[PDB]
């Protein structure tokens, strides 16, 4: 019966079930496998259990004695599903770009959700935008707020999440996440800090000249090359502009680009009231003095400064926060800051 069929399928299997990546679709009941060291014979492939479901370059079950194709690999999962396969919205504290929000909207949601305009005005959707600037000003923050502000299930993909030194694990995660983006849904595969090709290295990593080079080749051929977009929103924002390979600076790969200054007085007071709200404010302290002195508050000093000001105060268990506590909080946060002459020597 069926139990006997399963017992026979197990009879075909050798107790030590090695693992070998398929090389090519050759269906004369034998394939050309590649185990952890690349055992590539014309080993038989079990016919009844699906022999042709898995593609070439995919892990399958292998024998030990003859390394025969034992079967399709088990359901494997990458360590990023919880971040990518997603189970703050527009703005919980309006007071920042107040515009790049709208622009990433028009560049991602409007194209993706209603792509009935690119034939309405002979146009093409933005296949890629880059957003960059200081180490935290409103680049990835907007993307995080855009994840909730969308009619689609966004995906979070840390640029370093794709750094696994296993053989082809780079291309493996490319394949997995892209089979997601294409055969899960029209998703929002957001990948940040993707500028990691320029001027550093790792200890938990081998020679990148020949380890992640073909990995990036696979990733590029996947995203904006072959098996092209269609409607697969995978936009690549950054922080820098320089250290990158111009193989993608050319359009097509990515079309638009956006930067991020640091917020202005109008937005300084905004994010102040956003953060200074977390404490019973001693209103005699002058936010505007902090705003003009710290006139280049990317967005970390504001948060850190107000949190540490609350800490300074509530160390004394006071409700109000005198100005000196704010001074100490900021100056601890704000090291190495000398904005006087120059200049410094004028008006």
């Amino acid at each position: 019966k069926q139990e006997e069929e399963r017992s026979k399928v197990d009879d075909l299997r050798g107790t030590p079930m090695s693992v070998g990546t398929l090389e090519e679709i050759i269906d004369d009941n034998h394939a050309i496998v590649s185990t952890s060291v690349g055992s590539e014979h014309y080993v038989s492939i079990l016919s009844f259990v699906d022999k042709d479901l898995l593609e070439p370059g995919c892990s399958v079950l292998l024998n030990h004695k003859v390394h025969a194709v034992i079967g399709v690999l088990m359901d494997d999962t990458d360590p990023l599903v919880t971040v990518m396969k997603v189970e703050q919205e527009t703005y919980a504290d309006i007071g920042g770009l107040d515009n790049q929000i709208q622009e990433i909207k028009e560049s991602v949601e409007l194209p993706l959700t209603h792509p009935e305009y690119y034939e309405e005005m002979g146009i093409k959707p933005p296949k890629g935008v880059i957003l960059y600037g200081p180490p935290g000003t409103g680049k990835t923050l907007l993307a995080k707020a855009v994840a909730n502000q969308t009619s689609a299930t966004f995906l979070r993909v840390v640029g370093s999440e794709l750094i696994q030194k296993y053989l082809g694990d780079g291309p493996k995660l490319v394949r997995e996440l892209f089979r997601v983006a294409e055969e899960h849904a029209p998703s929002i595969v957001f990948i940040d800090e993707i500028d990691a090709i320029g001027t550093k290295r790792y200890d938990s990593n081998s020679g990148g000249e020949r380890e992640i080079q073909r990995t990036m080749l696979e990733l590029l051929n996947q995203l904006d090359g072959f098996d092209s977009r269609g409607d697969v929103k995978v936009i690549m924002a950054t922080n820098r502009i320089e250290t990158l390979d111009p193989a993608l600076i050319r359009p097509g790969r990515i079309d638009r680009k956006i930067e991020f200054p640091l917020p202005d007085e109008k937005t300084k007071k905004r994010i102040f009231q956003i953060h200074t709200s977390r404490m019973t404010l001693a209103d005699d302290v002058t936010l505007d003095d902090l705003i003009m002195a710290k006139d280049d508050l990317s967005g970390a000093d504001i948060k850190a400064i107000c949190t540490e000001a609350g800490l300074m105060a509530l160390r004394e268990r006071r409700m109000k926060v005198t100005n000196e506590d704010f001074k100490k909080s900021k100056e601890n946060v704000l090291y190495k800051k000398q904005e006087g002459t120059p200049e410094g020597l004028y008006l």
């Binding site: 009844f48 005005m121 146009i123 079309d255």
Partner: protein, 337 residues
């Protein structure tokens, strides 16, 4: 269990690992091999094979013990390689027209002249190296096969040369073909040699190309195009009137090809006819067609913001503000007249 015992009956054979080839000896072939990465193997095949079906640079079957060559296979297969503009950069058009059609159409202007049919171009240049090949596709006959030298950057010895023969003979099957190799800057024109033991598949591949392009069944009703951004690194082997013999070039057109491409991309989308281009042309200081196409895209972005159908020169005005002031580099022009 539809075949749960035949697989247990196919068992009598387990041989022929990957076993790539290196080269071969004489007085007996003695083909040289590496299995996967282990070592070099100057093997003697299993005589029940062909002394030539084991062409070096192929993963052939080979004994698990004696390493004698067995039933091969190239499981590396084909999936490795990926016009109203007639009249562009003006001078380029005539030389291109001649080099393409006149041998393809009338081997009399040269053969009787004794000069040779111009059948090659040393192009160098937003220039449009592909758009020219496509305006040619309007004219060769109807054949246009894209093979970019970038994809041609492959890391398998002879696989490049094997693709050379593949493309060269697929072209010779058809006629009036087009084969567009670019990034010869990335490919190389001067025969740089390093003891790195690396980029030599390019070496064998390019010698095979020299063999198979022109002469030895030349392109004829086929055009195989290797061109550059710059004639910077040439070689005394390419200036041959048989391989590449026109040496055209183009760069940024002033405004006329510009205006033309403006109108091209305009009618290519929902635009307002009452707009002009020479005004926009003055706005355009220096740009490639894609940049200009990007202006069109930004006009489309405005027409996505505001409900526009015939994209007006005011939509294009904002698009110009963007591309040439808000995208000239960033924004750093104003505050001094």
């Amino acid at each position: 269990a539809a075949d749960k015992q035949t697989l247990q009956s196919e068992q009598p054979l387990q041989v022929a690992r990957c076993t790539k080839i290196i080269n071969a000896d004489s007085e007996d072939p003695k083909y040289i091999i590496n299995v996967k990465q282990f070592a070099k193997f100057v093997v003697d095949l299993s005589d029940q094979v062909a002394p030539t079906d084991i062409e070096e640079g192929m993963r052939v079957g080979v004994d698990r013990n004696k390493y004698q060559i067995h039933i091969p296979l190239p499981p590396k297969i084909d999936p490795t390689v990926t016009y109203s503009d007639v009249g562009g950069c003006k001078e380029q058009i005539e030389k291109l027209r001649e080099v393409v059609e006149t041998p393809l159409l009338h081997p009399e202007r040269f053969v009787n002249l004794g000069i040779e049919p111009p059948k090659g171009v040393l192009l160098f240049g937003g220039t449009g190296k592909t758009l020219c090949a496509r305006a040619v596709a309007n004219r060769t006959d109807a054949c246009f096969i894209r093979v970019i030298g970038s994809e041609l950057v492959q890391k398998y010895v002879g696989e490049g040369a094997r693709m050379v023969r593949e493309l060269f003979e697929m072209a010779r099957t058809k006629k009036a073909c087009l084969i567009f190799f670019d990034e010869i800057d990335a490919i190389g024109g001067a025969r740089f040699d390093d003891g790195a033991g690396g980029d030599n598949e390019v070496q064998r591949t390019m010698l095979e190309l020299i063999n198979q392009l022109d002469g030895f069944d030349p392109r004829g009703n086929i055009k195989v195009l290797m061109a550059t951004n710059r004639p910077d690194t040439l070689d005394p082997a390419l200036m041959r009137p048989g391989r590449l013999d026109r040496k055209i070039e183009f760069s940024l057109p002033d405004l006329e090809g510009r205006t033309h491409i403006f109108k091209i991309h305009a009618r290519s989308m929902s635009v307002e006819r009452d707009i002009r281009f020479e005004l926009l042309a003055r706005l355009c200081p220096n740009s490639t067609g894609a940049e200009i196409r990007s202006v069109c895209t930004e006009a489309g972005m405005f027409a996505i913001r505001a409900r526009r159908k015939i994209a007006t020169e005011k939509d294009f005005l904002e698009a110009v503000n963007k591309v040439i002031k808000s995208y000239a580099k960033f924004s750093a022009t104003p505050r001094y007249m």
